[PDB]
Amino acid sequence: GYLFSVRGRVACVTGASSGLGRRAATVLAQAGAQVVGVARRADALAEWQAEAGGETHAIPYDLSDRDGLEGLARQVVDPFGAPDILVHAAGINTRQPADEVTPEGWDITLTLNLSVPFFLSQYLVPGMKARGWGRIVNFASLQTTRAFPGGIAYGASKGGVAQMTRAMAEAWSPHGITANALGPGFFRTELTAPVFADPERAARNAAQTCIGRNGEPEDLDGPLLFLCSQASAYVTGQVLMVDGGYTAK
Amino acid sequence: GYLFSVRGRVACVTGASSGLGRRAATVLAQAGAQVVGVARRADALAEWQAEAGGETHAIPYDLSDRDGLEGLARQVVDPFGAPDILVHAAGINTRQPADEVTPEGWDITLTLNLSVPFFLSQYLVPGMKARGWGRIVNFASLQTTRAFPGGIAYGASKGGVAQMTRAMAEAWSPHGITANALGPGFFRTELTAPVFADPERAARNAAQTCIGRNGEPEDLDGPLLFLCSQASAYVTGQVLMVDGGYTAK
Amino acid sequence: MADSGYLFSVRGRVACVTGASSGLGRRAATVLAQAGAQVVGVARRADALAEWQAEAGGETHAIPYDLSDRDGLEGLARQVVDPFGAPDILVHAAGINTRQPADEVTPEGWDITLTLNLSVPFFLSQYLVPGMKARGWGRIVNFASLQTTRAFPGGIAYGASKGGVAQMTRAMAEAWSPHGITANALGPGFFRTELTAPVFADPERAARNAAQTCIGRNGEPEDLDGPLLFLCSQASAYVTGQVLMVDGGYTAK
Amino acid sequence: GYLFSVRGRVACVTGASSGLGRRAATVLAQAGAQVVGVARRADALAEWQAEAGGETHAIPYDLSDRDGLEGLARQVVDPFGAPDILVHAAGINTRQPADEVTPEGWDITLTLNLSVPFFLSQYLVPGMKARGWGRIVNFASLQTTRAFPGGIAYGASKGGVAQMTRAMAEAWSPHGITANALGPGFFRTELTAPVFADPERAARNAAQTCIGRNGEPEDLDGPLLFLCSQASAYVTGQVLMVDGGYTAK
């Protein structure tokens, strides 16, 4: 049971003001990790801190600013020290189908979904190396493997994430840092507004799973804590789909 | 914490007299499940029961006898009631290269590794359906995806296990039964004796992982309990590799 | 034809195709015979085999044999080599789907699916590989499925077998490709055959499956020709241990 | 039994001055396609043209310049009319290990290996759509799936490529355009000089394949022509590994 603890660890979670990142940041805080939540909007982070309890700190930062990311990383280590756990839950889907992709929509998708996870990890790994222990949790997608309408830049980024996660393990796992990717199926969030707003679409997606339902926020708590804890010490370089068996059918 | 509990559950573990099945059976028992361990040898099962503590029951049975499996299933329900968790860890690798495969070595490999998991599952799922809750844990392999010397029947069986696991989810997960496969990399057991007996070979395999070491028995505890608990309710039809990132390189 | 077109030649090769009386096996056997291979077709029924030989043209030979008979496979292999000499190309197109859902699977329906779809491909290949090794050249083509990776209703024994096939194909390559023999699996999507009668018989089903592909249609027989000949020729010399999906992009969505 | 013809087609091949791109452009020229070859250096493009024979046109262009891509596309259509076949063989591997990745090295790899193929496709697909027929050939890698030393940006890009190819099929294959990726193993080129320069490394990689050898230029011809012809009309969204079975072990 100790096996699954994150008590006394330090975590940084990006995308912590909404969606699955907010859930992850709250789970980790309620499980006793000290949590640094990063997202654009101070007011949304303050509501997060109010719900989350435990011991947290908020940092408003626009993760589309890559030049500033090394300064963010210094901010991240200030409240509680170097993080042991890093969760890259910030992300975007512009939903531009191929013929309508703009340079701007392509670029913001690769920046936020792929490049920012890489560099923020690069900046934060030294502290983990020093302790000989770290957990990196990237966010893969059904669109790591299956192309959906409007998804082309998103799936490019998310096929990138999976290989990036393997490459993170190849570089950093000899030093005690594991890197894996949670692959949520369809959960009600900001990214999935069209999939859920049309109920016929939502129900088709539910029927595509083996269980027969879409995801609820609580469905990610277990797999998150597993990937953030001693339980997963020999699991690295893997994508763990949390999708009710969508990918089995 | 409670998310990862197996207290009050009943598990059946095949292959419980040695190797990874014995580890799984012990972990489950120490974690508060009632465990029914199935293996060929009574004396080996009795040593298991002695190591394990908790509440367990041993059933000596030669799982190559498929005609008898329905009777085995009735034996398995008798000590503690119908199992909630089933772990198919019994297996064989005859190590016959393709040109030397015999009908008998082929057939015993398919029987033990593929057909027995299916039928014992078939017999034991009714009790899970009645409760609307179940966990099936199959054993996949690096040879689900990568062909090793002497491996052809083994890999046929383990490729089959991966797809069988997705098919178990498609059949059974509407009823609250999840089916997943643990994919150990190289752990010191009965099946892996040549991989370990030559140290140069053992070290090449260790170097193929991201972490740089082969598996130890404790490395499977976390992933097992995750796959046997509430924590993985929305995880079904998946193969979860516990291989130190062997498959990432 | 460009000189490189001759990379895809099967002229003067010997092929054995199982399942040659119907479905995709029959198309594969006919394509190879029309492309100038000498083709040994294996199937249960002498009469359906005769219809095949009539359609095919070229140079062919029929062998009626019940591939559920593993005992007799070594004697099949002797029969296969008799008309044209040892085959250079082996195509394992015989297969079954009993469509029994998990709760209704019988020992017999599980068993016949593993026999025909997995064990027979293995043993027949084992018996015919020596001839290929003697020449330093061979092509094995197995049949994978959408159900190599995605579980469909009634599919559980079939999927077990087809996930098996994929790994078995990797293992055939690991054992035999040092000797000049490549082994790959074609993965057809949904094509109109014996095995897919329920998928097609309900038009709404057929259309949902067409819409699941990227192109928007189910398979037609001729769609298998190119991929088959590629996997049976010099063109694929450095392609081994692979599953080649011919599914209109079903598996991309 | 022609099916595999490219006679009469127009092809655009990027990276046509060296390596596998140069092989592809020559193969397609010698098979009777009119070929537009795109690469940085006029003089190396001119040697190519001399070597190739057939009917060709060279366009010197720095593919790191995304701003000018729409203009390149106009140049590409000028000599022979709109291309039917597009082969994205230009690529880079900076070989920076994770801890030493620079923003510039990461950016150039995503640009050349992922963003350029998307945009140049986007600009050239209209011509294909008008005819109801096209073929797009991307370049995947062993690092689509397996992380090698120095590979992290490359691998990010190439996992991106494979999803991008699936998403290209989803967008464009209803209009007669197929999109697939060739996945070469290890062939003697600019990208792979350290793998080949050290003979012990070269031999280890050869031994990792099923056949037991590295690739030769001619090994790409058949798989290329298959992906560029009528033969592959019902093959779309696929990665076709041309690796001697590296990925089977």
Numbering used by the authors:
A (entry chain A), B (entry chain B), D (entry chain C): 5 to 253
C (entry chain D): 1 to 253
The article reads:
The crystal structure of RpHpsO shows that it exists as a tetramer in the asymmetric unit, with seven-stranded parallel β-sheets sandwiched by six α-helices, constituting a typical Rossmann-fold domain in each monomer. RpHpsO is a member of the short chain dehydrogenase/reductase (SDR) family, which has two defining features, an N-terminal domain responsible for coenzyme NAD(H) or NADP(H) binding and a C-terminal domain harboring the essential catalytic residues. The results showed that the orientation of the C3-OH of R-DHPS was toward the reactive center (C4) of the nicotinamide ring of NAD+ with a distance of ~3 Å, which was appropriate for hydride transfer. Ser145 and Tyr158 both formed hydrogen-bonding interactions with the C3-OH of R-DHPS. The Ser, Tyr, and Lys residues are conserved in other SDR family enzymes and constitute a catalytic triad, suggesting their essential role in RpHpsO catalyzation of R-DHPS. However, enzymatic activity of the Leu116Ala mutant for R-DHPS did not decline significantly. This demonstrated that Ser145, Tyr158, and Lys162 function as catalytic residues in RpHpsO. Gln147 formed a hydrogen bond with the chirality-center hydroxy (C2-OH) of R-DHPS, suggesting that Gln147 may have a vital role in specific recognition of R-DHPS. Mutant Gln147Ala abolished the most enzymatic activity of RpHpsO for R-DHPS. These results demonstrated that the interaction between Gln147 of RpHpsO and C2-OH of R-DHPS appears to drive the specificity of RpHpsO for the R-DHPS enantiomer.
Dihydroxypropanesulfonate (DHPS), a globally abundant organosulfur compound, serves as an ecologically important currency for nutrient and energy transfer from phytoplankton to bacteria in the ocean. A novel chiral-selective DHPS catabolic pathway was identified in marine Roseobacteraceae strains, where HpsO and HpsP dehydrogenases at the gateway to DHPS catabolism act specifically on R-DHPS and S-DHPS, respectively. R-DHPS is also a substrate for the dehydrogenase HpsN. All three dehydrogenases generate stable hydrogen bonds between the chirality-center hydroxyls of DHPS and highly conserved residues, and HpsP also form coordinate–covalent bonds between the chirality-center hydroxyls and Zn2+, which determines the mechanistic basis of strict stereoselectivity.
